[PDB]
Design a protein around this ligand. Structure first.
Ligand SMILES: O=S([O-])[O-]
Length: 236
């Protein structure tokens, strides 16, 4: 039935330098119809950001480096009135935060692409740097390049000390893994590693514990676009 929920989607797209990949992405976004879309690994340089244009999604905020490497973007649908108050872009293109409100209701979105190496330490550092901005209306999403619990890997291997430290930091900031909270017994994955034939959930949606009761539904979406599956959160 008709309602005022928003949907926030996160996808690591694995590059957007070829025109067709941009149209395939535009088609997929059009079909998913997210209020807000967090994309990682655009691989667009700070010179080439204007290449990313998606009909229906005219408001776009990007953080990019100088190389065809990393690159993150937050796209807001034309049907969504997100009045921003603050946009903080990583100079190296690994995260972007936008803060603002929809419907008089405040919302802080942090889109992160952690490096393959040192990911859990990287994410903890970003949280600390942004501590004053990450309030009780926060969603953090993206490709953390790490599991957060044992169920996030097919190996069932315990998570390392740096990941344990990351989880402590999340808890100190009143943040929780929304997907794992809604689906505690889930053994779904977003990424397949062919070298070891293993599967992992390295893409996450984390948020303020205060937003828990607003989190209606969250799901993983397989796709032909990328080597990562998307995740979608429906928020009251
Ligand atoms: O598109 S506006 O939010 O700068």
């Amino acid at each position: 039935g008709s309602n005022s929920h928003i949907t926030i989607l996160t996808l690591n797209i694995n590059g957007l330098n070829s025109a067709i990949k941009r149209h395939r992405l535009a088609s997929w976004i059009k079909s998913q119809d997210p209020s807000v879309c967090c994309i990682q690994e655009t691989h667009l340089t700070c010179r080439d950001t204007h290449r990313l244009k998606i009909k229906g999604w005219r408001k776009i905020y990007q953080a990019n480096g100088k190389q065809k490497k990393a690159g993150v973007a937050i796209l807001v649908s034309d049907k969504t009135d997100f009045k921003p108050t603050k946009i903080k872009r990583d100079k190296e293109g690994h995260y972007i935060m936008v803060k603002g409100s929809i419907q008089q209701e405040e919302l802080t979105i942090l889109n992160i692409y952690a490096p393959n190496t040192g990911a859990p330490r990287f994410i903890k550092q970003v949280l600390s740097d942004l501590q004053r901005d990450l309030d009780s209306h926060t969603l953090i999403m993206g490709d953390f390049n790490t599991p957060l619990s044992t169920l996030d890997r097919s190996t069932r291997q315990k998570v390392n000390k740096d990941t344990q430290e990351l989880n402590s930091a999340l808890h100190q900031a009143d943040l929780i893994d929304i997907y794992r909270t809604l689906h505690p017994k889930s053994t779904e994955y977003t990424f397949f590693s062919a070298p070891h034939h293993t599967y992992s959930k390295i893409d996450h949606i984390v948020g303020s514990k205060a937003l828990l009761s607003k989190c209606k539904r969250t799901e993983i979406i397989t796709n032909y676009l990328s080597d990562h599956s998307a995740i979608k959160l429906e928020l009251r």
